[PDB]
């Protein structure tokens, strides 16, 4: 497989480069660490490495240095399905791993690997899934199904047999191919059992990875296939620092295989502070529709927005802290909606918010960002095509985020980064010593530097 | 429950104190963050809070300010079982949660809570365990059974219904009691199904928590109950920064319940670099025994150690990522062994290592820490009493570590700390700006 031969050349080089960097720049200061970081969830602390993606405040997320527009339409467009427009996640995965753009044949090899492997989900995984009570939350089922498949881990098997550190990335890759192929099968099983009367649809060996998820959930529509391709592409990766990506890296750092690291990550994604944002946006849009007996006018939405902001509250999906521009993942979703469901009533509200809410936020004066993120837009797209089971939205997010998690996990085992092991501090120590400590950026801090 | 009444007073104060510290001292600097931290797994970076325990590089772990000798032997001896010497882990949990030494009655109340709730493991958790192929690694089975029981989460349910942030710690405590009571039942189930012919032994309502695990595994000797009590005490907690404790805090930070956060932690503990050291040491000890037809002499062992290091190998059970002297968890185990199995051949090798190996690792000069850690001593104790299933040793570790993880998760939810969300950097950026950055503790750093 091309992906593998290429990595066999790039990874030895990256490994050497990283060893040199740690040697010659290890002592370079990036910032001050504060009491505030320790009690404030490490916010802003430059404590991890991720090379798959990178957020620029003035551009949004890039994938190995390419913008979403370059990959989606521009001059570096990734391969699509036959007759499709939307980029295939398979090709994006090639890019995240290698840092190089795939050829059509590269993508097809990855698609065939996925299609083949998607037939290899162990029967006992479904036994595990069926032993869980059907009212179990779908993210609990998703994580459990993944973890049960740890029995099939090549990394775990090869590690116990004795393999060189240099082979770690090979085993991580094999495991990632198996796990990624399995994810849509597990996800669809959960969907069909909980919400569609426990009737089950087999993978179509002539569909790509994203489309097969839609197929197996029971949604056979070209538009739905295209939405799922775009959705999986957009949500694939967002740096290393979010709870689920970080959980993945942390468990990975102890040499736990991808079934263990990624199921752990899904337990983090299942958290209400990490995995529900898209659902909350959608329920808000729906609350506006019902409040206004239909699409609100520009004046009604303005007033409702002022009422919300003046009463200390925020508007879901808008005004997050980092970007100074619209999330490029939002823009691609809007472009999809304009093309494919412009008259859908909930979309009309999301569209009006894109006009109105940024104008209101500029005027209100708090947010150095008046613009939306990805979660502002995704829910109405799912809901339009009949995917209405809110709890399950987090599972779709999880399937997508597996692309970036698997890439990250393969790369860091290629780099041979060590176990993650920060130092914790006690409140006792803090209370004793805090007076003694300089204010960060102060003249005293400069003195004690 | 005394525990909960005590928390119902202490947590509101601690919460207020933490809000004060964040407002007043948030901007105080503790150290420089470097490029090396980001590529070096955050080693030394003061990035997390943990009030349950603290590891002093030059003294070892203290639990809420108490040393292991203080709590096991010394002037602050925790409660023991009737006729026992070893401290009950139930009282250690009380200490971790409250910061106060428990009475006998406090401990009995926690024991009874575990006893009662041990009868309440859902039938479907066993169905989940039986659906996994019996040759599945035991730590995969353990994590999966814990995760399946997430359906019974009171935190999840109350959060969905709408609860005030101040009720968090209470739902975490209820969940922790349930989960802790379930862990020995799940662990024993795994043990019996994999290794003892799939015959199952019910919990004993009159045993304490540790003893009940031993009983349900099929061991009823007093000395084994005492070993389990000591083992569960020693492995209970070791700051917030180790992979399992940290994974628990990270997932808990997103408001995921203890079944999710602790099952995530167990997937980390299952990793070779976190949870395998016990077994590696025992196999190494057994390799020596077989190599020398018995206990080696000082000179044989000395020579072996040198040959080992100069052949590029590591001596298992020596060194630590933070510890810098003899692990007091090692010393407690040695004491148990001198008392209870002084003539055990494998123990005699462990003992001899204690005399010889430090000297060697010092002169070799690569190990930052030349002394034994907890893992140098645990395997020979288990092995002596007939617990021989190497892979399962990590599950025993996990059951113990749940005591620290649950204490930490309750506390951090009481304090109301936010979501853990550091910043990742790229190699591209490092290459672009590294030369222009100041060296940590330099003149240019001072100017900037
Ligand atoms: C003020 C602002 C600029 C920063 O947001 P933030 O609240 O610091 O964001 P986080 O999600 O990282 O942290 C949430 C914190 O808000 C706290 N918070 C929210 N409302 C609160 C209230 N009424 N009282 C106390 N704390 C409150 C939470 O409890 C949590 O803990 P902390 O205050 O102890 O730190 C905000 O307007 C904003 O833009 N937030 C979005 C930023 C963001 O994280 N974007 C996501 C990018 S993917
Ligand atoms: C625990 C351990 C992983 C910590 O590693 P660490 O923090 O990187 O250790 P140090 O800072 O002392 O490493 C410095 C050097 O000493 C070596 N070293 C450390 N402990 C050693 C040991 N017991 N035997 C041989 N060499 C050892 C390291 O390999 C390293 O050499 P290198 O720079 O060529 O790689 C390590 O001491 C070890 O491998 N111990 C054996 C297994 C074990 O008992 N683990 C349980 C830990 S609770
Ligand atoms: O997962 C996400 O949406 C991104 C995120 O929270 C972060 O970078 O902290
Ligand atoms: O603390 C560590 O780094 C590893 C360890 O000893 C433990 O978790 O008990």
PDB file of N, CA and C in Angstrom, chain B residues 311-384:
ATOM      1  N   UNK B 311      24.982  -4.491  28.762  1.00  0.00           N
ATOM      2  CA  UNK B 311      24.378  -5.057  27.560  1.00  0.00           C
ATOM      3  C   UNK B 311      23.151  -4.253  27.118  1.00  0.00           C
ATOM      4  N   UNK B 312      22.997  -3.028  27.654  1.00  0.00           N
ATOM      5  CA  UNK B 312      21.944  -2.099  27.259  1.00  0.00           C
ATOM      6  C   UNK B 312      20.591  -2.351  27.939  1.00  0.00           C
ATOM      7  N   UNK B 313      20.543  -3.211  28.968  1.00  0.00           N
ATOM      8  CA  UNK B 313      19.261  -3.573  29.557  1.00  0.00           C
ATOM      9  C   UNK B 313      18.988  -2.720  30.794  1.00  0.00           C
ATOM     10  N   UNK B 314      17.696  -2.682  31.160  1.00  0.00           N
ATOM     11  CA  UNK B 314      17.229  -2.045  32.383  1.00  0.00           C
ATOM     12  C   UNK B 314      17.044  -3.105  33.477  1.00  0.00           C
ATOM     13  N   UNK B 315      17.416  -2.762  34.718  1.00  0.00           N
ATOM     14  CA  UNK B 315      17.105  -3.541  35.912  1.00  0.00           C
ATOM     15  C   UNK B 315      15.690  -3.217  36.427  1.00  0.00           C
ATOM     16  N   UNK B 316      14.697  -4.128  36.301  1.00  0.00           N
ATOM     17  CA  UNK B 316      13.323  -3.771  36.671  1.00  0.00           C
ATOM     18  C   UNK B 316      13.158  -3.578  38.185  1.00  0.00           C
ATOM     19  N   UNK B 317      12.321  -2.597  38.548  1.00  0.00           N
ATOM     20  CA  UNK B 317      11.928  -2.355  39.925  1.00  0.00           C
ATOM     21  C   UNK B 317      12.796  -1.298  40.588  1.00  0.00           C
ATOM     22  N   UNK B 318      13.759  -0.765  39.819  1.00  0.00           N
ATOM     23  CA  UNK B 318      14.633   0.308  40.270  1.00  0.00           C
ATOM     24  C   UNK B 318      14.425   1.525  39.359  1.00  0.00           C
ATOM     25  N   UNK B 319      14.509   2.719  39.954  1.00  0.00           N
ATOM     26  CA  UNK B 319      14.272   3.968  39.239  1.00  0.00           C
ATOM     27  C   UNK B 319      12.814   4.415  39.301  1.00  0.00           C
ATOM     28  N   UNK B 320      12.614   5.722  39.121  1.00  0.00           N
ATOM     29  CA  UNK B 320      11.281   6.285  39.006  1.00  0.00           C
ATOM     30  C   UNK B 320      11.337   7.591  38.212  1.00  0.00           C
ATOM     31  N   UNK B 321      10.197   7.931  37.596  1.00  0.00           N
ATOM     32  CA  UNK B 321       9.997   9.175  36.868  1.00  0.00           C
ATOM     33  C   UNK B 321      10.000  10.404  37.783  1.00  0.00           C
ATOM     34  N   UNK B 322      10.003  10.211  39.112  1.00  0.00           N
ATOM     35  CA  UNK B 322       9.960  11.358  40.076  1.00  0.00           C
ATOM     36  C   UNK B 322      10.689  11.000  41.375  1.00  0.00           C
ATOM     37  N   UNK B 323      10.397   9.831  41.948  1.00  0.00           N
ATOM     38  CA  UNK B 323      11.040   9.380  43.180  1.00  0.00           C
ATOM     39  C   UNK B 323      12.552   9.496  43.031  1.00  0.00           C
ATOM     40  N   UNK B 324      13.229   9.775  44.161  1.00  0.00           N
ATOM     41  CA  UNK B 324      14.675   9.961  44.182  1.00  0.00           C
ATOM     42  C   UNK B 324      15.341   9.224  45.342  1.00  0.00           C
ATOM     43  N   UNK B 325      14.540   8.576  46.180  1.00  0.00           N
ATOM     44  CA  UNK B 325      15.099   7.724  47.269  1.00  0.00           C
ATOM     45  C   UNK B 325      14.294   6.419  47.288  1.00  0.00           C
ATOM     46  N   UNK B 326      14.416   5.623  48.346  1.00  0.00           N
ATOM     47  CA  UNK B 326      13.725   4.341  48.431  1.00  0.00           C
ATOM     48  C   UNK B 326      12.221   4.582  48.606  1.00  0.00           C
ATOM     49  N   UNK B 327      11.428   3.908  47.771  1.00  0.00           N
ATOM     50  CA  UNK B 327       9.988   4.080  47.791  1.00  0.00           C
ATOM     51  C   UNK B 327       9.519   3.545  49.137  1.00  0.00           C
ATOM     52  N   UNK B 328       8.912   4.359  50.012  1.00  0.00           N
ATOM     53  CA  UNK B 328       8.341   3.810  51.242  1.00  0.00           C
ATOM     54  C   UNK B 328       7.266   2.718  51.048  1.00  0.00           C
ATOM     55  N   UNK B 329       6.703   2.604  49.843  1.00  0.00           N
ATOM     56  CA  UNK B 329       5.780   1.513  49.543  1.00  0.00           C
ATOM     57  C   UNK B 329       6.566   0.205  49.429  1.00  0.00           C
ATOM     58  N   UNK B 330       7.824   0.295  48.961  1.00  0.00           N
ATOM     59  CA  UNK B 330       8.710  -0.863  48.955  1.00  0.00           C
ATOM     60  C   UNK B 330       8.975  -1.297  50.392  1.00  0.00           C
ATOM     61  N   UNK B 331       9.274  -0.334  51.262  1.00  0.00           N
ATOM     62  CA  UNK B 331       9.748  -0.690  52.592  1.00  0.00           C
ATOM     63  C   UNK B 331       8.631  -1.385  53.376  1.00  0.00           C
ATOM     64  N   UNK B 332       7.370  -0.986  53.161  1.00  0.00           N
ATOM     65  CA  UNK B 332       6.269  -1.614  53.885  1.00  0.00           C
ATOM     66  C   UNK B 332       6.120  -3.078  53.465  1.00  0.00           C
ATOM     67  N   UNK B 333       6.341  -3.338  52.179  1.00  0.00           N
ATOM     68  CA  UNK B 333       6.199  -4.676  51.635  1.00  0.00           C
ATOM     69  C   UNK B 333       7.323  -5.590  52.140  1.00  0.00           C
ATOM     70  N   UNK B 334       8.544  -5.053  52.210  1.00  0.00           N
ATOM     71  CA  UNK B 334       9.679  -5.775  52.771  1.00  0.00           C
ATOM     72  C   UNK B 334       9.399  -6.169  54.219  1.00  0.00           C
ATOM     73  N   UNK B 335       8.832  -5.239  54.977  1.00  0.00           N
ATOM     74  CA  UNK B 335       8.471  -5.519  56.361  1.00  0.00           C
ATOM     75  C   UNK B 335       7.482  -6.684  56.456  1.00  0.00           C
ATOM     76  N   UNK B 336       6.421  -6.641  55.631  1.00  0.00           N
ATOM     77  CA  UNK B 336       5.445  -7.716  55.579  1.00  0.00           C
ATOM     78  C   UNK B 336       6.164  -9.035  55.299  1.00  0.00           C
ATOM     79  N   UNK B 337       7.110  -9.037  54.349  1.00  0.00           N
ATOM     80  CA  UNK B 337       7.803 -10.248  53.928  1.00  0.00           C
ATOM     81  C   UNK B 337       8.717 -10.805  55.035  1.00  0.00           C
ATOM     82  N   UNK B 338       9.481  -9.916  55.693  1.00  0.00           N
ATOM     83  CA  UNK B 338      10.352 -10.326  56.794  1.00  0.00           C
ATOM     84  C   UNK B 338       9.517 -10.976  57.891  1.00  0.00           C
ATOM     85  N   UNK B 339       8.328 -10.421  58.117  1.00  0.00           N
ATOM     86  CA  UNK B 339       7.415 -10.908  59.138  1.00  0.00           C
ATOM     87  C   UNK B 339       6.800 -12.245  58.727  1.00  0.00           C
ATOM     88  N   UNK B 340       6.402 -12.399  57.447  1.00  0.00           N
ATOM     89  CA  UNK B 340       5.479 -13.477  57.110  1.00  0.00           C
ATOM     90  C   UNK B 340       6.080 -14.527  56.191  1.00  0.00           C
ATOM     91  N   UNK B 341       7.097 -14.225  55.377  1.00  0.00           N
ATOM     92  CA  UNK B 341       7.660 -15.271  54.540  1.00  0.00           C
ATOM     93  C   UNK B 341       9.163 -15.086  54.393  1.00  0.00           C
ATOM     94  N   UNK B 342       9.921 -15.024  55.511  1.00  0.00           N
ATOM     95  CA  UNK B 342      11.355 -14.721  55.447  1.00  0.00           C
ATOM     96  C   UNK B 342      12.179 -15.771  54.697  1.00  0.00           C
ATOM     97  N   UNK B 343      11.699 -17.018  54.668  1.00  0.00           N
ATOM     98  CA  UNK B 343      12.447 -18.103  54.036  1.00  0.00           C
ATOM     99  C   UNK B 343      12.027 -18.359  52.586  1.00  0.00           C
ATOM    100  N   UNK B 344      11.094 -17.562  52.053  1.00  0.00           N
ATOM    101  CA  UNK B 344      10.679 -17.715  50.666  1.00  0.00           C
ATOM    102  C   UNK B 344      11.884 -17.376  49.794  1.00  0.00           C
ATOM    103  N   UNK B 345      12.261 -18.338  48.961  1.00  0.00           N
ATOM    104  CA  UNK B 345      13.431 -18.240  48.101  1.00  0.00           C
ATOM    105  C   UNK B 345      13.413 -17.001  47.196  1.00  0.00           C
ATOM    106  N   UNK B 346      12.285 -16.753  46.532  1.00  0.00           N
ATOM    107  CA  UNK B 346      12.148 -15.617  45.647  1.00  0.00           C
ATOM    108  C   UNK B 346      12.291 -14.323  46.459  1.00  0.00           C
ATOM    109  N   UNK B 347      11.689 -14.280  47.646  1.00  0.00           N
ATOM    110  CA  UNK B 347      11.886 -13.140  48.517  1.00  0.00           C
ATOM    111  C   UNK B 347      13.374 -12.937  48.857  1.00  0.00           C
ATOM    112  N   UNK B 348      14.127 -14.028  49.060  1.00  0.00           N
ATOM    113  CA  UNK B 348      15.551 -13.919  49.363  1.00  0.00           C
ATOM    114  C   UNK B 348      16.314 -13.275  48.207  1.00  0.00           C
ATOM    115  N   UNK B 349      15.875 -13.482  46.963  1.00  0.00           N
ATOM    116  CA  UNK B 349      16.522 -12.801  45.855  1.00  0.00           C
ATOM    117  C   UNK B 349      16.215 -11.301  45.908  1.00  0.00           C
ATOM    118  N   UNK B 350      14.943 -10.947  46.171  1.00  0.00           N
ATOM    119  CA  UNK B 350      14.481  -9.558  46.211  1.00  0.00           C
ATOM    120  C   UNK B 350      15.292  -8.777  47.251  1.00  0.00           C
ATOM    121  N   UNK B 351      15.442  -9.392  48.422  1.00  0.00           N
ATOM    122  CA  UNK B 351      16.192  -8.868  49.552  1.00  0.00           C
ATOM    123  C   UNK B 351      17.644  -8.593  49.129  1.00  0.00           C
ATOM    124  N   UNK B 352      18.276  -9.595  48.532  1.00  0.00           N
ATOM    125  CA  UNK B 352      19.650  -9.481  48.085  1.00  0.00           C
ATOM    126  C   UNK B 352      19.803  -8.363  47.059  1.00  0.00           C
ATOM    127  N   UNK B 353      18.830  -8.224  46.155  1.00  0.00           N
ATOM    128  CA  UNK B 353      18.841  -7.112  45.222  1.00  0.00           C
ATOM    129  C   UNK B 353      18.900  -5.784  45.970  1.00  0.00           C
ATOM    130  N   UNK B 354      18.211  -5.731  47.117  1.00  0.00           N
ATOM    131  CA  UNK B 354      18.130  -4.519  47.917  1.00  0.00           C
ATOM    132  C   UNK B 354      19.529  -4.114  48.385  1.00  0.00           C
ATOM    133  N   UNK B 355      20.396  -5.095  48.666  1.00  0.00           N
ATOM    134  CA  UNK B 355      21.757  -4.812  49.115  1.00  0.00           C
ATOM    135  C   UNK B 355      22.659  -4.405  47.944  1.00  0.00           C
ATOM    136  N   UNK B 356      22.543  -5.102  46.814  1.00  0.00           N
ATOM    137  CA  UNK B 356      23.544  -5.038  45.764  1.00  0.00           C
ATOM    138  C   UNK B 356      23.175  -3.963  44.737  1.00  0.00           C
ATOM    139  N   UNK B 357      21.919  -3.945  44.269  1.00  0.00           N
ATOM    140  CA  UNK B 357      21.598  -3.254  43.029  1.00  0.00           C
ATOM    141  C   UNK B 357      21.818  -1.744  43.136  1.00  0.00           C
ATOM    142  N   UNK B 358      21.489  -1.061  44.260  1.00  0.00           N
ATOM    143  CA  UNK B 358      21.670   0.394  44.329  1.00  0.00           C
ATOM    144  C   UNK B 358      23.110   0.833  43.996  1.00  0.00           C
ATOM    145  N   UNK B 359      24.097   0.271  44.723  1.00  0.00           N
ATOM    146  CA  UNK B 359      25.526   0.497  44.507  1.00  0.00           C
ATOM    147  C   UNK B 359      25.877   0.481  43.022  1.00  0.00           C
ATOM    148  N   UNK B 360      25.369  -0.525  42.315  1.00  0.00           N
ATOM    149  CA  UNK B 360      25.670  -0.729  40.910  1.00  0.00           C
ATOM    150  C   UNK B 360      25.092   0.409  40.057  1.00  0.00           C
ATOM    151  N   UNK B 361      23.805   0.731  40.258  1.00  0.00           N
ATOM    152  CA  UNK B 361      23.111   1.724  39.446  1.00  0.00           C
ATOM    153  C   UNK B 361      23.693   3.127  39.662  1.00  0.00           C
ATOM    154  N   UNK B 362      24.237   3.383  40.867  1.00  0.00           N
ATOM    155  CA  UNK B 362      24.940   4.622  41.178  1.00  0.00           C
ATOM    156  C   UNK B 362      26.189   4.776  40.310  1.00  0.00           C
ATOM    157  N   UNK B 363      27.080   3.778  40.365  1.00  0.00           N
ATOM    158  CA  UNK B 363      28.327   3.832  39.626  1.00  0.00           C
ATOM    159  C   UNK B 363      28.042   3.873  38.126  1.00  0.00           C
ATOM    160  N   UNK B 364      27.114   3.043  37.636  1.00  0.00           N
ATOM    161  CA  UNK B 364      26.734   3.081  36.227  1.00  0.00           C
ATOM    162  C   UNK B 364      26.294   4.497  35.816  1.00  0.00           C
ATOM    163  N   UNK B 365      25.626   5.224  36.727  1.00  0.00           N
ATOM    164  CA  UNK B 365      25.496   6.674  36.650  1.00  0.00           C
ATOM    165  C   UNK B 365      24.435   7.222  35.685  1.00  0.00           C
ATOM    166  N   UNK B 366      23.606   6.359  35.067  1.00  0.00           N
ATOM    167  CA  UNK B 366      22.579   6.787  34.113  1.00  0.00           C
ATOM    168  C   UNK B 366      21.221   6.989  34.799  1.00  0.00           C
ATOM    169  N   UNK B 367      20.840   6.086  35.720  1.00  0.00           N
ATOM    170  CA  UNK B 367      19.583   6.210  36.447  1.00  0.00           C
ATOM    171  C   UNK B 367      19.634   7.445  37.347  1.00  0.00           C
ATOM    172  N   UNK B 368      18.613   8.313  37.251  1.00  0.00           N
ATOM    173  CA  UNK B 368      18.509   9.444  38.161  1.00  0.00           C
ATOM    174  C   UNK B 368      18.235   8.922  39.582  1.00  0.00           C
ATOM    175  N   UNK B 369      17.557   7.758  39.693  1.00  0.00           N
ATOM    176  CA  UNK B 369      17.138   7.167  40.964  1.00  0.00           C
ATOM    177  C   UNK B 369      17.611   5.709  41.053  1.00  0.00           C
ATOM    178  N   UNK B 370      18.610   5.400  41.924  1.00  0.00           N
ATOM    179  CA  UNK B 370      19.200   4.059  42.003  1.00  0.00           C
ATOM    180  C   UNK B 370      18.495   3.059  42.926  1.00  0.00           C
ATOM    181  N   UNK B 371      17.330   3.450  43.465  1.00  0.00           N
ATOM    182  CA  UNK B 371      16.675   2.729  44.549  1.00  0.00           C
ATOM    183  C   UNK B 371      15.420   2.036  44.030  1.00  0.00           C
ATOM    184  N   UNK B 372      14.886   1.047  44.795  1.00  0.00           N
ATOM    185  CA  UNK B 372      13.690   0.306  44.389  1.00  0.00           C
ATOM    186  C   UNK B 372      12.395   1.108  44.542  1.00  0.00           C
ATOM    187  N   UNK B 373      11.464   0.853  43.620  1.00  0.00           N
ATOM    188  CA  UNK B 373      10.107   1.374  43.714  1.00  0.00           C
ATOM    189  C   UNK B 373       9.143   0.279  44.225  1.00  0.00           C
ATOM    190  N   UNK B 374       7.859   0.624  44.347  1.00  0.00           N
ATOM    191  CA  UNK B 374       6.854  -0.291  44.880  1.00  0.00           C
ATOM    192  C   UNK B 374       6.853  -1.620  44.120  1.00  0.00           C
ATOM    193  N   UNK B 375       7.129  -1.585  42.796  1.00  0.00           N
ATOM    194  CA  UNK B 375       6.972  -2.748  41.933  1.00  0.00           C
ATOM    195  C   UNK B 375       8.087  -3.777  42.107  1.00  0.00           C
ATOM    196  N   UNK B 376       9.164  -3.408  42.792  1.00  0.00           N
ATOM    197  CA  UNK B 376      10.236  -4.358  43.010  1.00  0.00           C
ATOM    198  C   UNK B 376       9.796  -5.445  44.001  1.00  0.00           C
ATOM    199  N   UNK B 377       8.717  -5.223  44.774  1.00  0.00           N
ATOM    200  CA  UNK B 377       8.435  -6.113  45.891  1.00  0.00           C
ATOM    201  C   UNK B 377       7.063  -6.798  45.820  1.00  0.00           C
ATOM    202  N   UNK B 378       6.115  -6.279  45.033  1.00  0.00           N
ATOM    203  CA  UNK B 378       4.739  -6.769  45.111  1.00  0.00           C
ATOM    204  C   UNK B 378       4.586  -8.190  44.549  1.00  0.00           C
ATOM    205  N   UNK B 379       5.237  -8.506  43.434  1.00  0.00           N
ATOM    206  CA  UNK B 379       5.013  -9.787  42.766  1.00  0.00           C
ATOM    207  C   UNK B 379       5.388 -11.000  43.614  1.00  0.00           C
ATOM    208  N   UNK B 380       6.492 -10.912  44.361  1.00  0.00           N
ATOM    209  CA  UNK B 380       6.895 -12.091  45.107  1.00  0.00           C
ATOM    210  C   UNK B 380       5.896 -12.351  46.221  1.00  0.00           C
ATOM    211  N   UNK B 381       5.241 -11.316  46.728  1.00  0.00           N
ATOM    212  CA  UNK B 381       4.248 -11.518  47.786  1.00  0.00           C
ATOM    213  C   UNK B 381       3.022 -12.234  47.228  1.00  0.00           C
ATOM    214  N   UNK B 382       2.487 -11.740  46.106  1.00  0.00           N
ATOM    215  CA  UNK B 382       1.333 -12.378  45.465  1.00  0.00           C
ATOM    216  C   UNK B 382       1.666 -13.830  45.097  1.00  0.00           C
ATOM    217  N   UNK B 383       2.816 -14.001  44.452  1.00  0.00           N
ATOM    218  CA  UNK B 383       3.233 -15.301  43.980  1.00  0.00           C
ATOM    219  C   UNK B 383       3.318 -16.280  45.153  1.00  0.00           C
ATOM    220  N   UNK B 384       3.862 -15.852  46.283  1.00  0.00           N
ATOM    221  CA  UNK B 384       4.043 -16.749  47.422  1.00  0.00           C
ATOM    222  C   UNK B 384       2.702 -17.323  47.909  1.00  0.00           C
TER     223      UNK B 384
END
